[PDB]
Design a binder for this molecule. Structure first.
Ligand SMILES: CN1CCc2cccc3c2[C@@H]1Cc1ccc(O)c(O)c1-3
Ligand SMILES: CN1CCc2cccc3c2[C@@H]1Cc1ccc(O)c(O)c1-3
Ligand SMILES: [Ca+2]
Ligand SMILES: [Ca+2]
Ligand SMILES: [Ca+2]
Ligand SMILES: [Ca+2]
Ligand SMILES: [Ca+2]
Ligand SMILES: [Ca+2]
Lengths: 90, 90
């Protein structure tokens, strides 16, 4: 696989690693999302230690309002992080 | 870096590898986009060999209509490929 193909598969893998922990195995609840950010973006994003931050993140990502982050909403999250990563050095 | 962090950086890297070849170094023209797909998604996507397919792909991705694919539009492309990759086995 190319680096791009590996990256695509890595996005799928990390989503399911976390979404499969509790409840709907195909969506991230608040706790799953929090651990995803804290464990897997520890170099990019500040560790989340406040409920209010967890709440605000979910509220931002939860486009359809069902209180969870589904795959499509996670793709939008990845675009946000990647864009922020890309804009950091400008 | 985590796998997710590596993936984020890989998206940035592949975009610039191709966008930096000709013209605006921060956007993909048709030829840059074609080679990106043919070289870096050879296992996922059919190789593009027809002008009409290259045209249709750019038309689909070029949300703002400037005839090129910028970083934001590339993020949407990545979401499309990843979603298609994710839905393939269902
Ligand atoms: C390892 N790289 C080599 C090639 C390259 C070429 C332009 C830009 C970047 C990179 C990267 C990583 C990178 C990370 C964060 C950013 O904000 C960036 O703008 C870039
Ligand atoms: C290596 N993997 C291990 C874990 C895992 C768990 C669910 C789903 C997938 C994966 C992947 C790759 C994968 C690739 C394409 C898909 O359409 C998928 O649904 C998955
Ligand atoms: Ca879940
Ligand atoms: Ca389990
Ligand atoms: Ca949702
Ligand atoms: Ca270019
Ligand atoms: Ca050059
Ligand atoms: Ca454009």
């Amino acid at each position: 696989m190319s680096e791009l193909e590996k990256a695509v598969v890595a996005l799928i893998d990390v989503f399911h690693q976390y979404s499969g922990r509790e409840g709907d195995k195909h969506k991230l609840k608040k706790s799953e999302l929090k651990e995803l950010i804290n464990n897997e973006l520890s170099h990019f994003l500040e560790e989340i230690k406040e409920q209010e931050v967890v709440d605000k993140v979910m509220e931002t990502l939860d486009s359809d309002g069902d209180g969870e982050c589904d795959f499509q909403e996670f793709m939008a999250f990845v675009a946000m992080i990647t864009t922020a990563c890309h804009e950091f050095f400008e």
